Design a binder for this molecule. Structure first.
Ligand SMILES: OC[C@H]1O[C@@H](O[C@H]2[C@H](O)[C@@H](O)[C@H](O)O[C@@H]2CO)[C@H](O)[C@@H](O)[C@H]1O
Ligand SMILES: OC[C@H]1O[C@@H](O[C@H]2[C@H](O)[C@@H](O)[C@H](O)O[C@@H]2CO)[C@H](O)[C@@H](O)[C@H]1O
Ligand SMILES: [Mg+2]
Ligand SMILES: [Mg+2]
Lengths: 733, 733
């Protein structure tokens, strides 16, 4: 190609110093002061920047390139996870939309806004499967299902990169965290991951492959061990699998200080040996620790690495810059030199309509006793709890360049909706935690949690006076965003105790109690499901969160969100997930005995299963019908069902298709998602839903990692959640 | 060999019906009524019996063999886990002795008593590694450490089997549960086990190999999947590994209904296919479901199995009976035909001296503020709690033929110890649980828990009056044995709530509070460690438990037990174990960062670490000294330390040696136990302790299961627990 000629001609000009400079990815910080970094760019010693995110600041770096010998342009990256300046819901909330077009819209707008500020790359999407609700990074993924997360992984990559990676409104996707990062033992961040190869191939690796097959330009390597070998030093993972088996042609990027962390993992006794392990494993670009620039020349001179190791790494960096259009115009995302200056954070540069529409789709109605919701815009509404007026929490963790002061709180959304037609009464009620050690943690590094200095009792008495003066209570409760972030693993999945004390006292007033939950992970909600009159899961809903939440609470939008991760009854049940194996002694409704796979001291199964979520209307499914009883190899089967809105309000629901392979050479899950359809219906409307199934839906990795579909029975389940289904069978020939 | 000749000549005479009959293992019960079973034994349709446990009942079954054509004798098995009639501590408490001779004595007496009743075989030892405290079967193992569990696995097998399996006081060991059963996901019994091969080989499989290499005659196959394949159908596990790699020449026995359970696992669609999978995998003997007798003839005639499958399985049964001496004399464990009858449960047939001496060694002193223990035999002692007068709970789960009415309760042990020197005041204080659903579960089959009909409040007021009338309170609290048994997985590791309400009320009296804990698993003891004045862990200490516990509490025995399983701070930390990996971002207890592998909402690390346990005396260790800084291949290294009793009472402690391999081609544990010495010292005595290390101590399984020692640094740690050590390094050349 012209591309491989261009790259080979450029690399034939480069010294090893220049090639190694391309591998260096750095941020402005205590480790890399701005002026020292600018001098290094002028010297050709920097390949890319992260965490510089405004047009003037990015232009100033790109300007320094003109002073180097070869003038190779930088690329600029950032953590655009669920929004750049207009923040969408957290990924776990986006997944609850069950709508690839909603997810695509969030990614497209994110890319538009990030590229509008001069960024070329996001460290996104995060596509790690999560089965352990304790892990603080569950908020960054799409939940527990391999099918859904694989589909959304490909959608996010395509939406970011567009039809052309050189387009000024495109960014390159660096899919993360390769691999298995969300299986951390104990749900402790960065911890050991240990799993069988069949589980790895069938359940955990497919989302990364979906990103590679969608054309992701980059892969960000994870921080964890995989079966004893840190990903950063894992040649099987980064070379044999990612390059040789999957055919990935793009850029591998280390995580932050990950090469140096090989010493703490016990793979290397010094930085020189760590550098050798990372580059030979297949890590191209070294984030922040500068080990590559410090040690690659010495390693090469000693014969401890090959010239081909440097050349591979450099070619991948240059090829990413080529695809981004940066050799054609290094300023293609930076406008013209005499464009007038502007306010990066101007209102007119936000996308509030997209954020509000997307955030409505993710909200999950978990409980609604006797039609309490939707509320009428009238009377006296008490708005109570530490998350009601929180701008910092509504934008979530990994909020990129989001500005808390631009965010709509739940309180403000309700004020906007009711204008002068209803009276809102506010009381904080409790601090986010009553445990001072937890507040100390959450205010470590940055003051992110406002602490009311009053006693817990004084806050409670104020909230009880407010509730007593109202017709009903909207309690806005749950986690602060720093409880569901990197390194914030939890041993308790309940609402914090200070807030549960508040909820118990509010319940005792007899006022109708509506819970508006914010949180970044599944929560244990047994008391709430028994006592609250209605419960709306809002995740962290973003810059327009409070307006989208008010839209649902007042019935402008009929809640349509459904869970993509199972909600355990308690932390002592972890893990719970819907695509588990039967065991020899299943406990389910049809197997209720003592000598089954169960706990004895708590009810069994999730409180809310995968695919659960209610509506202000009711839906009906006709009987499931398959197009035949037998499926030949090479053929497709259809599964048909009619969905009807049998209630009085328009709304959407999600029709889910699951497969079981009840007899196989491995024990296969009791159900596995293999299709879904989100459908919006007016009252009395029907839609015929046709699912297609072929052999590709039926295959699995056996003990020898053969990817096989075995002849025999398959069971096809359809329903509006993973627990409320019916089945029909066919036979594969 | 005489055995091979004898078996070949017998099998050459046998029909396939006779060979298949040898594979059938059954119990008298609903499924096999006694008289029908006796007719089947006469017809040569039965190979062995389990759960028939008295000499007259066993002799009656062996008498039926005379009616079969070849008169092949039965063998008789039972679950003699930690005692037959004289019950020793549960295994987790036996392990806490750190004394292979104490563990061997428990096994030898168990074998003496079981063989005295006519039994030939125990389904024991249980050698599954346990890192998940929720699992109800942790009580049956030896804790979390591979070295210690492997050592005790071999000790148990040799103690059962003696110098000759034909000796009338020997029984055959059927080591269980092969394999990985204790790694059940979620700690739910029977659940999925999924792990890497390096973890399997390094940490989980060595105890089963130790039993094989100690000459175990039988292996009981587990109920769980291993990486998707049920053990019962796992040809890799039962044939490639157990026979071809490890050289096992004995008998494999299915678990209870395990062949039929291949249908529920989704490996088979019918009983015929389940039978085929089990026999071809390598399961010789079919427990209770009778699938082998029903289907093997049809499978053979269809060519779906080979004659060699039946012949392998039959040869292994005959070989077990040969080694048990049953072809030389089928009545060798059943006395003479005219022996007088006797009372099986006579006091004169118990071994109370041995039970008391053994039970003393496993008790673990967890806390002792200001030398409250040992108690003087004087004053007024309140004995309070639901476990104080419990005979059924002190003998534990898997109590075999133990008779609760023969057991010494904690109350009775204290009464025996003090005679008239002190006054005991009793109050039950609380029921074992306040939750009627849990009490109904525990009493669902048999009355196992006495439910005091009084209200919780009346029991508490009685206990508070009792405490006020006393000088100090001994609170006997924890789990009932049915909480730590097969299928009894727990979501909460605390003392039950009814009992914690009692403890808090007792604390508020200001009386000194001694907790005597009974339990079959690690418990979460944060409140207790803060508030109790002293804490003694007694596990379930067996038929003489109450006397052994009083021995420690009054200082006749200086506590010397040490934990063999880490005690988590809460269930939300599971798993916690001492031989974990460092990660790239380890948390430092002395300078603890946010961006480390940790929880934010609880203190980190176990409450009590592996190897922890206090004494009534003080011990000192001199500096660790290694015999050299460099170790040549094939040479031995010595690690020396002097232990001194620097206190005022005689006592024992356990000096533990740990190794770390800080740079390796896999991430290795922060430490691994590689030796120990239990040492009893009078005051002022000193012992030079010499550990020997060579290459075998330094090897590990790499990613490709190469089992070698890599040259480089090793760190040697010695101390009296896993957390408080001193360290020196050497280099392997
Ligand atoms: O630890 C906070 C610190 O993390 C750095 O590295 C991030 C990386 O940017 C991101 O893509 C990945 O998902 O997580 C890494 C942390 O595990 C960030 O670059 C830096 O800005 C901080 O956010
Ligand atoms: O389920 C209670 C039932 O278990 C049967 O099988 C036991 C087996 O005897 C024992 O060795 C093993 O460790 O556990 C199995 C259950 O998982 C017993 O045979 C029967 O007596 C009951 O105890
Ligand atoms: Mg099948
Ligand atoms: Mg080493």
């Amino acid at each position: 190609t012209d591309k491989e000629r261009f790259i080979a001609s450029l690399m034939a000009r480069m010294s090893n110093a220049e090639k190694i400079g391309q591998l260096r990815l750095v941020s402005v910080g205590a480790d890399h002061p701005k002026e020292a970094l600018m001098a290094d760019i002028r010297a050709g010693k920097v390949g890319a920047i992260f965490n510089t995110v405004t047009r003037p600041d990015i232009r100033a770096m790109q300007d320094q390139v003109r002073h180097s010998r070869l003038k190779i342009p930088l690329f600029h990256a950032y953590d655009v996870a669920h929004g750049h300046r207009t923040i969408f819901p957290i990924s776990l909330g986006l997944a609850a939309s069950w709508d690839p077009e909603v997810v695509a819209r969030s990614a497209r707008i994110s890319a538009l806004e990030a590229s509008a500020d001069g960024l070329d790359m996001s460290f996104s999407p995060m596509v790690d499967i999560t089965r352990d609700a304790r892990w603080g990074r569950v908020s960054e993924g799409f939940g527990e299902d391999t099918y859904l997360t694989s589909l959304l992984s490909g959608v996010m990559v395509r939406a970011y990169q567009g039809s052309n990676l050189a387009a000024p409104d495109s960014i390159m996707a660096a899919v993360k965290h390769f691999a298995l990062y969300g299986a951390a033992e104990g749900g402790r961040d960065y911890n050991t991951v240990d799993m069988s190869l069949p589980r790895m191939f069938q359940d955990y690796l497919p989302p990364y492959k979906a990103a590679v097959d969608a054309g992701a330009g980059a892969v960000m390597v994870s921080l964890n061990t995989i079966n004893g070998v840190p990903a950063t030093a894992n040649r099987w993972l980064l070379t044999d699998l990612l390059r040789q088996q999957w055919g990935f042609k793009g850029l591998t990027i280390s995580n932050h200080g990950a090469v140096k962390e090989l010493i703490k993992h016990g793979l290397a006794g010094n930085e020189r040996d760590a550098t050798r392990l990372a580059i030979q494993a297949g890590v191209d670009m070294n984030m922040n620790d500068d080990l590559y620039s410090t040690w690659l020349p010495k390693l090469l001179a000693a014969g401890e690495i090959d010239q081909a190791d440097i050349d591979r790494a450099c070619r991948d960096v240059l090829a990413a810059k080529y695809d981004l259009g940066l050799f054609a115009d290094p300023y293609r995302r930076l406008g013209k030199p005499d464009d007038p200056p502007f306010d990066t954070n101007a209102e007119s540069r936000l996308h509030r309509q997209a954020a509000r529409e997307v955030a409505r789709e993710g909200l999950v109605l978990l409980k609604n006793r006797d039609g309490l919701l939707p509320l009428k815009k009238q009377g006296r509404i008490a708005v109570i709890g530490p998350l009601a007026k929180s701008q910092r929490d509504v934008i979530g963790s990994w909020s990129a360049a989001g500005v808390p002061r631009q965010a709509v709180t739940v309180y403000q959304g309700l004020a906007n909706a009711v204008g002068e037609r209803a009276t809102l009464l506010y009381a904080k009620g409790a601090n986010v935690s009553g445990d001072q050690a937890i507040l100390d943690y959450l205010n470590s590094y940055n003051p992110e949690v406002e602490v009311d200095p009053r006693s817990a009792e004084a806050m409670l008495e104020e909230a009880l006076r407010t509730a007593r003066d109202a017709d009903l209570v909207v309690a806005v409760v749950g986690e602060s965003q720093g409880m569901a972030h990197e390194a914030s693993s939890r041993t308790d999945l309940r609402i914090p105790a200070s807030q549960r004390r508040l909820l118990k006292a509010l319940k005792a007033t007899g006022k109708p109690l509506v819970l508006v939950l914010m949180n970044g992970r599944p929560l244990s909600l047994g008391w709430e499901q028994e006592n609250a009159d209605a419960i709306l899961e809002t995740w962290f809903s973003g810059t327009e969160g409070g307006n989208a939440i008010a839209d649902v609470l007042f019935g402008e939008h009929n809640p349509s969100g459904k869970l993509t991760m199972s909600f355990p009854r308690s932390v002592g049940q972890v893990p719970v997930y819907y695509n588990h194996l039967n065991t020899g002694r299943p406990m389910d409704h049809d197997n209720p005995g003592k000598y089954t796979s169960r706990y004895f001291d708590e009810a069994n199964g999730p409180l809310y299963p995968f695919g659960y979520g209610l509506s202000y209307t009711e839906f009906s499914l006709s009987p499931l019908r398959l197009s035949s009883e037998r499926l030949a190899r090479g053929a497709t089967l259809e599964a048909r069902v009619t969905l009807s809105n049998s209630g009085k309000r328009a709304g959407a629901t999600v029709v889910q298709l699951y497969l079981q392979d009840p007899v196989a050479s491995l024990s296969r899950p009791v159900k596995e998602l293999r299709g879904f359809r989100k459908v919006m219906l007016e009252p009395g409307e029907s839609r015929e839903i046709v699912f297609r199934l072929g052999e590709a839906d039926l295959k699995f990795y056996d003990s020898q990692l053969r990817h096989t579909a075995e002849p025999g029975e398959f069971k096809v389940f359809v329903g509006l959640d993973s627990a409320q289904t019916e089945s029909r069978s066919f036979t594969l020939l």
